[PDB]
Each structure stands twice: as C-alpha cells, then as structure tokens.
Design a protein around this ligand. Structure first.
Ligand code: ADP
Ligand code: MG
Length: 761
C-alpha cells in the first residue's frame, strides 16, 4: 500500500494514495493524516514492503524502479555501504571520507577469485570479475568508470589498479610502479576546481598488460585533452596544476633558491586563482613562512581529507624514486615548472605614437632573466620573440595584447610538452615487449556545461557523444541482439542513435572539426568566419542552432557568428566560439618554436625533438583508437555518484542523486538489467568440458540434454536460468551458480559428474 511520490529535495517521499483524478493521484505523506499533495500518475511508484532493509543487488528488489533504487542506495549509504550492484554493474556513492579498512590488503585478498555476489559489493569484485573473464575467455577487458566531476572516478580507477597489481602481480618493484605512477600524473594533470579539489584536467585509459599465465608484465597510459587554459589563469576559487603548489610548499630551500621560487601570490600564473595550500595543523608547521601567501596567512589553509600540498610533494618525490627517476630528471622537471612560472611574470607596456607596439616593462627584467636561465634561452632572443612578429622578410612590432598571447602560447605549449614527457616517462617505467591481454580502466570527464562553454567543453561533450553511442551499442544493442538470436523473449529497450550529432562534429570536410581546421589554414583566421561557415554549411541540421534560438537570457546578446548551440541529447549547449581557432592549434608559431628548439638545455630541446597541428583532429584520432579498444574488449561498468555539492560526508541529496541516476541512463535500463541474462555459455562448450569425465549414459545425451541433467542434479531451476537456442543463460544474482557450472578443474568436474550419475539412477 505505501508508495513513493515526488519530493522537491529528497527526489521521493513515502505516502499513501487517497484519491485519483484525471492525470493525478492524491498522496497523503506518511504519518501526516489530513495533509495531501497532487502527483502525476506516472511519477508515483510502488515501494518495497520493508523500508528498513537494504539489498546488495538492486535486481533483488521486489519492485525495481527509480524510487526504490534511490531508497536502497540511500539506506546503504547511511551505513557507509557505498557500493551496490545492478546485476554486474556497480553503483559507487562518494563517501567524502576514508571508510576504515575497506581498501586494506586483507580486504583485497578476501575478494580474490570470489564470484560476484559471494562477497559484499565492491570495486575489487568488479576488478576481479574483469580478471576472471580475461583469463577464462582469453579476451582483454575494459572497466569504464563514469560520473559527474567529484563523483569518484579517479579514486575508483586507483582502487581497481591497486587491486589488480597487488593480487596478480609478481611481488616485485614493477607491481608498485603502475600504482606509484598516479601521484606523478596527478601532480601535473590535476587541479583544484569548484567541483573537485583534485579534479582531473586530462582524461586517461590505463591498461595493465598480462602474459599467458595471467600475471602482470607492465602497463600503458593513454592521456587526453590536458586543459591548457588553466596554465595561465584560473578563477578565484580554483588553482593551477598541483605541481606548482606542491613545489612552492614542499621544495627544500636549496631548490627554492635555485628556481627563484617564492609564495604563490608573486606569480601571475597562480595569483588570479586561490594562493592557499591544502594543509592541516601538522603540515602547515612544515611549510616555511617564506612560502605562505598573504591570503594563506589571513584565511588559513584549504581543508581536504586527501590533498596536502607539502605531504603530496614528499609522496610525489618518493613516487619518482620508486619508479626509477633519478634526481637529475626530477630537477629537470622542476626547472621547466619554475621556468613557466617566471615566463608568466613577463609584463608588457604599449610603445609607438599609435600604441602599435610594445616593450617589456622594466619591472619584468628579473622575470625575463630567471625565465631565460631556467629554460636555457638567451634573454634578448626571448624578449624579441615575445615582442615582435617575423613575416616578406620583416620583423614587425606586436601590440601589448599580442605579446601577452605569445608569452601564454609558449607557456601552455612548454607545459603541455612537459606533461607528454611525464606520461611517456611513466610508460617507460613499466614497459613490456609482448602481452597476451590487458585490463584497461577508462577515467574521463562526462557531459558538462556552464554559463560559458568554450573549446574544452566542446571536445569533452564530443567525446561524450561517441562514448554514449558505445554504451548504447554494448548495453542495449549487442545485448538484445543476443537475447533475440537466442529466442529469450526479453522486452526490448530502444534508444535513438546519435550518429547525426557525431557526424555534425566529426564528418570529413563538412564536420565542425574540419571547418575549424580550414579556418586555422586561412591567411587571416577568424572565429567569426569559422562560426558563420558552420551555420552556412549546416543550415538544415536539427542538432545545430544560432545562439539567439536559446530560451536562456545569457545567450540573447550572442551574435550568430559568436557561437552555436549543439543539441546534444544530454542537453542543448551554447558554445561561445571566441578563441576556438587559437584553442584548436597545438603548434607554436615558428619563431617561438625555434627559440625553444635551440635551447642550451638538452632536456628542453628533448621536449621538442604556417605552423598548425589540429587539437580537434588529434583528439578525434585518439578517441577512435580508444573506441577500437573498447569495441574489441569485454566491458564492465562503474557508475560513480556525487552525493552533494558541498564535499561533505553523510549528506545524501536525494534529488541530486536521482537526477544522476536518470541522466546516466541507469533508470532507463533497470528492467532490461533485472529481466536480463548477464552470464551465458553454449551447450556445446559445457558438454565438451565434461565429456571426458562422463560415463556412457551421460555422453549419449545431446549437449542440451546433458546440461539439463547437470542443472537438475545440482538443484538449479528456472528462477536461476533459461535455455536459449544454443546457450544456457543465468540471471542477475546467479553468478556463483554459473561459475560453479563453468569451473574447469578436473577434480571439480569429476565431482559434479559423480553427482549427476547419482541423481540419474
Ligand atoms: N571511495 C572513496 N573513499 C574516500 N574518499 C573518496 C572516495 N571517492 C572519492 N573520494 C573523495 O572525493 C574526491 C573526489 O573524487 P574523484 O575520484 O577525484 O572524482 P572524479 O575523478 O570523478 O572527478 C576525492 O579526492 C576524495 O576526497
Ligand atoms: Mg578525476
């Protein structure tokens, strides 16, 4: 009798239906006799009879729907049980605190070789299942970790990597390397944002490669779309990459002196953002007074349960040592970092009777000297390349705005090349000649939109269209095509394909990426010319509109040539096209490229061992290699859920979590997953595995008939499995029973055959 009906902040609330009207149900909130509210008939759901219970698998719920799913994960979360299944898919709700012992070496050992459902839900069980499928099916595997910014994708990726390397490694130095590589990547690719103190500003696919014996031989990291804009300016609540603050907070005085470092408020590339360190009472006393900005001294430290700038600098140096980086390479990296900081302090003032030129401000003399010294450049060549443009064979003055752009382009390119070097260096620390298979973990930002959307949002939302299509093809298309071919009679869940949105962005010649590249190649590139060419070429495209077509008031003043709206199925996004041409070029101008290639420092020359490299098309190629890997492997899915927007523990925001369950597509697949068959094996393979152990009476049976006798003898029933035309299928929550049937050990096989022989008489 009690039902779940809508609630503005909790998503749902419990009540009773007390009336029905046209298009409405009158609900009485539980224990509030007299009170009533109207709800739409289709927004009212049956509730589980026991409101206090929780189930480890949402498929076990008598009434599985968005409301009972929300309630079950809420009950579990209130008890620090952050992991819950939807059959073989994992839901992970961010606790925002360290739950004791759940990631221990002892917890790791308890999950090894255990079937899904045998142990409580855990990221370790998803990792173990991928390993077992890899070894049994002799097929590489992918674990896709998804969710909003700050939901827990990076933390869960790291738990998967740690579980696999600790369980299936050799007990050597190289096993720890794949794990120790992360504090290094995060130092250069992660930053404080309003949504996550440790936000990933690049995407990644981390593969652990195994030999024929299913033992770890090494790894490989793919990195995508490092955010370049961050390198030069941040919003007051955000920071630049962690490395800058770990270095300022933790470097020895010898390094501080050598690199001419000071408190972060002294650097333009840090001082528009937050200049405070992540520290606690103990670590703050370890940071020297000369490292602390005025804001840090007034407001105190930033608080985080994970991040500590001083502690993280020490842990990063230890990680560098463990992976094989010598002190020389560590100082080479720090020198580039400081060189970029000093570059940002180079200021310009107008010159010429019509302000057509510029001069370095006299107060920027020291910044010029320190930068040139740290980057192995001549001061004059650097001053010249930043203040003039070479073009017949003339050296022309740059205006102040153009000099700022030259400095920043060099800073972003140097930093981005340093990041590429760091990722490649990490790959060189765990190399392998050959491998039989891999387990790859995908950790990349999903669909996102803000008041202002630029080229970075465009590429990530493009990536999301391509991955969403893979998700639909794997979970909906391929799964149901199997059920159909096997005659299972599973109710069809349909989806609308998004190839028209993908083609809009990526088609050869006509796609937005190709039209943008066209602009970069033109004599005088223009964001406006690019934008009008997109509107002109796709005038009849449903996924495209002018910014004026938006309902929102913020887009009312945006001109047709100043942006476009992409009608992504996840929501219509208005992109402001200013800087799209600049952001699409990964190559430095020739005169800045020469300056840096001719550095006196071998390390700097080695970072760089009409200049145009398309960021869009480079990313399209990387994404297509990733999609080739995903399509050729088995996929396991982890859906990370952010419980609130305040980074607090024990604060379950019902409507926020519901919205994520709906937007993730989780709600749309509930019935398909509950009525589905995630485990299957052919009658022929089962029969062939048991054949040599069988007596004549057993071998005489047709494979389908042998399988039936095997299942009957073991006490299995229709609630556990269904027979297809050529395969047996096991339902959610029947993984342990399926693994017992599949276990290929001679002693186990002979034992089950003995049981069948005994049942037959
Ligand atoms: N299972 C977890 N245990 C403890 N803290 C966690 C867990 N998952 C996430 N966190 C916390 O939440 C923060 C944000 O998580 P993160 O993995 O970086 O998110 P995402 O990569 O999805 O943006 C972490 O830095 C950490 O403080
Ligand atoms: Mg992350």
């Amino acid at each position: 009798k009690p039902v779940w009906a809508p609630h503005p902040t909790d998503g749902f609330q419990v009540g009773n239906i007390v009336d029905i009207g046209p298009d409405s149900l009158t609900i009485e909130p539980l224990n509030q006799k007299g009170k009533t509210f109207l709800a739409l008939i289709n927004q009212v759901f049956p509730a589980e009879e026991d409101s206090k219970k929780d189930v480890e698998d949402n498929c076990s719920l008598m009434y599985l729907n968005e409301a009972t799913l929300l309630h079950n994960i809420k009950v579990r979360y209130s008890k620090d049980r952050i992991y819950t299944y939807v059959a073989n898919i994992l839901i992970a709700v961010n606790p925002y605190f360290d739950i004791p012992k759940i990631y221990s070496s002892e917890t790791i050992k308890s999950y090894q070789g255990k079937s899904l459902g045998t142990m409580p839900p855990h990221v370790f069980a998803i990792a173990d299942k991928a390993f077992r499928d890899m070894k049994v099916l002799k097929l590489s595997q992918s674990i896709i970790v998804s969710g909003e910014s700050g939901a827990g994708k990076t933390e869960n990726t790291k738990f998967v990597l740690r579980y696999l390397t600790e369980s299936y490694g050799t007990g050597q130095d190289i096993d720890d390397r794949i794990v120790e590589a992360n504090p290094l990547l995060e130092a250069f690719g992660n930053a404080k944002t309003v949504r996550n103190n440790n936000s990933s500003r690049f995407g990644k696919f981390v593969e652990i490669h195994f030999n024929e014996k299913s033992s770890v031989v090494g790894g490989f990291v793919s990195h995508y779309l490092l955010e370049k804009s961050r390198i030069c300016v941040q919003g007051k609540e955000e920071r630049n990459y962690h490395i800058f603050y770990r270095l300022c907070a933790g470097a020895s005085e010898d390094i501080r002196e050598r690199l001419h470092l000071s408190s972060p408020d002294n650097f333009r590339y840090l001082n528009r953002g937050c200049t405070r360190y992540f520290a606690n009472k103990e670590t703050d006393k370890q940071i020297l007074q000369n490292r602390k900005s005025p804001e840090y001294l007034k407001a105190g430290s930033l608080k985080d349960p994970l991040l500590d700038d001083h502690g993280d600098f020490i842990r990063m140096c230890t990680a560098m040592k463990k992976i094989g980086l010598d002190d020389e390479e560590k100082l080479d990296l720090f020198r580039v970092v400081a060189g970029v900081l000093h570059l940002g302090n180079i200021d310009f003032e107008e010159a010429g009777s019509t302000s057509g030129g510029c001069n370095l401000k006299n107060k920027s003399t020291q910044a010029l000297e320190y930068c040139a010294e740290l980057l192995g450049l001549d001061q004059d060549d650097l001053r010249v390349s930043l203040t003039t443009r070479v073009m017949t064979v003339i050296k022309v003055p740059l205006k102040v705005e153009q000099a700022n752009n030259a400095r920043d382009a060099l800073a972003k390119t140097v930093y981005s090349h340093l990041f590429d070097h760091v990722v490649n260096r990490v790959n060189q620390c765990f190399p392998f000649e050959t491998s039989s298979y891999f387990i790859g973990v995908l950790d990349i930002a999903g669909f996102e939109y803000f008041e202002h959307n630029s080229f970075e949002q465009f590429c990530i939302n493009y990536c999301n269209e391509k991955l969403q299509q893979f998700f639909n093809e794997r979970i909906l298309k391929e799964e149901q095509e199997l059920y159909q071919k096997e005659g299972l009679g599973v109710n069809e869940v349909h989806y609308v394909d998004n190839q028209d949105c993908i083609d809009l962005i990526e088609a050869r010649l006509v796609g937005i990426l190709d039209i943008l590249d066209e602009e970069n190649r033109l004599p005088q590139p223009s964001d406006q010319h690019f934008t009008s060419a997109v509107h002109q070429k796709h005038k009849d495209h449903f996924r495209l509109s002018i910014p004026r077509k938006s309902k929102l008031a913020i887009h009312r003043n945006i001109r047709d040539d100043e942006g476009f709206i992409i009608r992504h199925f996840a929501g219509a996004v208005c992109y402001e096209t200013t800087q799209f041409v600049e952001k699409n070029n990964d190559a430095l101008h020739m005169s800045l490229e020469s300056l840096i290639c001719e550095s006196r420092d071998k390390f700097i020359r080695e970072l760089f061992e009409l200049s145009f490299i398309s960021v869009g098309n480079k990313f399209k190629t990387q994404l297509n290699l990733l999609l080739d890997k995903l399509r050729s492997t088995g996929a396991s899915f982890i859906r990370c859920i952010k419980p609130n927007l305040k980074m607090t523990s024990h604060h379950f925001e019902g409507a926020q979590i519901l919205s994520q369950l709906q937007c993730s597509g989780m709600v749309s697949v509930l019935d398909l997953m509950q009525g589905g068959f995630p485990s299957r094996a052919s009658f022929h393979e089962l029969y062939n595995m048991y054949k040599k152990y069988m007596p004549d009476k057993l071998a005489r049976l047709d494979p389908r008939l042998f399988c039936k006798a095997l299942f009957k003898a073991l006490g299995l029933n229709e609630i556990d499995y269904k027979f297809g035309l050529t395969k047996v299928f096991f339902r959610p929550g029947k993984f342990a029973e399926f693994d017992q049937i599949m276990k290929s050990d001679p002693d186990h096989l002979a034992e089950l055959v003995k049981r069948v022989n005994h049942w037959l008489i």
